[PDB]
Design a protein around this ligand. Sequence first.
Ligand SMILES: [Cs+]
Ligand SMILES: [Cs+]
Ligand SMILES: [Cs+]
Ligand SMILES: [Cs+]
Ligand SMILES: [Cs+]
Ligand SMILES: [Cs+]
Ligand SMILES: [Cs+]
Length: 106
Amino acid sequence: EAVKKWVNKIIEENIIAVFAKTECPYCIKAISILKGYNLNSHMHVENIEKNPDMANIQAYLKELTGKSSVPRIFINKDVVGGCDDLVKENDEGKLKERLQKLGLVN
Ligand SMILES: [Cs+]
Ligand SMILES: [Cs+]
Ligand SMILES: [Cs+]
Ligand SMILES: [Cs+]
Ligand SMILES: [Cs+]
Ligand SMILES: [Cs+]
Ligand SMILES: [Cs+]
């Protein structure tokens, strides 16, 4: 219960929520893509490796998204997925549409 409530708070209190780990190139790439949209004011990055309950967190993220791997990316509580998913959305215009509907980009 405690771990799920903690993850839920991160997802629900930040429009852009990224679960990451230490020295994680696709985490770094995904976060940098998001910051390139000037999203930092509404972003939260949680390093779940530096956490005693990493496995519980990962299992819950898999229950929510289908994968336990990081990065795990949510936008307004909707599942984006990993960095490859973000790259697909970015390249195909979906990421910008998402952010426009939230008022985060013009
Ligand atoms: Cs920037
Ligand atoms: Cs951009
Ligand atoms: Cs931030
Ligand atoms: Cs532990
Ligand atoms: Cs939503
Ligand atoms: Cs783009
Ligand atoms: Cs706005």
